[PDB]
Amino acid sequence: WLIKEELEEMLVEKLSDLDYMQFIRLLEKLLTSQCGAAEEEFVQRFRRSVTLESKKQLIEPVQYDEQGMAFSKSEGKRKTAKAEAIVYKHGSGRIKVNGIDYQLYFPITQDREQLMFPFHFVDRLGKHDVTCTVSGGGRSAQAGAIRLAMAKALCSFVTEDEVEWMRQAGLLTTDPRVRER
Amino acid sequence: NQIKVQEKYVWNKRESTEKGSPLGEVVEQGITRVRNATDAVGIVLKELKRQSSLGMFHLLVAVDGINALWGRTTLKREDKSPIAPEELALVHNLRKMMKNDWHGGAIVSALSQTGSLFKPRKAYLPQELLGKEGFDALDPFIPILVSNYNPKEFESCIQYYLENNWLQHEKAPTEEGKKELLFLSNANPSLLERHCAYL
Ligand SMILES: Nc1nc2c(ncn2[C@@H]2O[C@H](COP(=O)(O)OP(=O)(O)O)[C@@H](O)[C@H]2O)c(=O)[nH]1
User: Fold this and answer.
1) For residue B61, which phi and psi values (nearest 5 degrees)?
2) Where on the chain is N6-acetyllysine found, per UniProt (chain A)?
3) Chain A contact for B185, CB < 8 A?
């Protein structure tokens, strides 16, 4: 419903709160009855709009390499660590971190679990190849940045429902928690 | 007892092993008096490399972590100065066994970065671990690669662990648990075993 101040601006007259309540009650009563097209337009003169926060999720385009393989690229950030990931449409679950296999680049099991989380959530383990380059930060910041970048790249090969589920799981959101002065 | 020495070895002015004595005596002299332990190892090697050539028996030289012989040590003198690997009688007598100046056997060895001195964690190829000196010493040699489990080996290892009831988590037998194990270990036998240890 139009707010009180917007009704003020459109009417070019100041009105109290109770009379705005009364007008909104009349509008709701009109809505309840079998209002026609003219009455529907008259009501729509008084109803503003709103938006969502799922269409603002950017799905990166699918590129093609020289060999004709489809892929998708993305970026992620965590503390001072910055990651740039490429996810291939087809693969065997090979992840190369700075040209090094992930189990060698990430000795700690926690980081390997962080890298596993995006594919396990959408059940695509062993179905994609990943080539990612990370720089800066520590082991955990690098793992988080890689996870974000690789989820943002994987959004291209999944359904929109799966993209929304990944968003709601907190996978496609940059973590803004950084060291304070 | 079948193998018999071919020279008189003098442990001390009082004690010596006479020619023709069984090899076990020498070993016993090394097991009883540790003062002559290191001298007793070399003699054993000196016999085995020799007699195998004569054809008495076949000898297998199996050295794990062979990359240590031509590297560096963390041992010091009393002047806090470093000691080289060739200064150690135990290491100096084992290099002679790596040379292919004998026949009647085979020499098998396996590299290992675990426990190595002055090597990065990710160095695994022959030169990176051996060094120039080590590669030259072993050259010519036949290298054999050991990789991670292929899908058949990984599935068989997990079936063995399940057959021993070693995976107690209720989800581990399921296929999703196997995919998660495969990803977290990447089919590496050691990582898979360590992760299955506490499941
Ligand atoms: N106690 C004792 N040890 C010996 C005797 N002879 C050889 N050895 C040991 O057995 C090993 C035989 O290796 P060898 O061919 O003689 O090497 P090298 O003489 O130092 O060049 C030596 O390293 C000695 O430590 C001996 O007559 N008495």
Assistant:
1) -105, 105
2) 89
3) yes
Considering only the beta carbons, identify the residue of A100, A103, A126 that sits closest to B191. Answer: A103
B93 and chain A in contact, CB less than 8 A:
no
Which residues form the pocket of ligand 1, taking CB atoms under 6 Å from any ligand atom?
B 9-11, 36, 39, 42-43, 46, 89, 93
Q: Which has the closest alpha carbon to B146: B184, B194, B187, B176? A: B187
Q: Using an 8 Å Cβ cutoff, are B157 and B167 in contact?
A: no
Closest CB to A113 among B122, B182, B184? B184
State this model's resolution in angstroms. 2.5
Instruction: Quickly list DSSP for B23-73.
Output: HHHHHHHHHH-GGGHHHHHHHHHHHHHHHHHHTS--EEEEEETGGGTTS--
DSSP calls for A3-35 = -HHHHHHHHTS---HHHHHHHHHHHHHHHHS--
Nearest C-alpha in A relative to B186: A103
Write the DSSP symbol of residue A70.
E
Complete DSSP assignment for B63-122? EETGGGTTS----B-TTS-B--GGG-HHHHHHHHHHSS---SEEEEEE---TT-SS--TT
φ/ψ bin of B20: left (φ > 0), alpha (ψ from -120 to 50), beta (otherwise): left
C-beta atoms surrounding B147 within 10 Å: 9
Can you say how many angstroms the Cα of residue B175 is from the centroid of all Cα atoms in its chain?
38
Tell me phi and psi for residue A174, to 5 degrees: -65, 135
Omega before B140 cis (within 30°)?
yes
Q: Work out the minimum CA distance from A68 to partner chain B, whole angstroms.
A: 27
Which residues of chain B have a CB within 8 Å of the CB of A120? 179-180, 183
List the single residue in A with minimal CA-CA distance to B185: A103
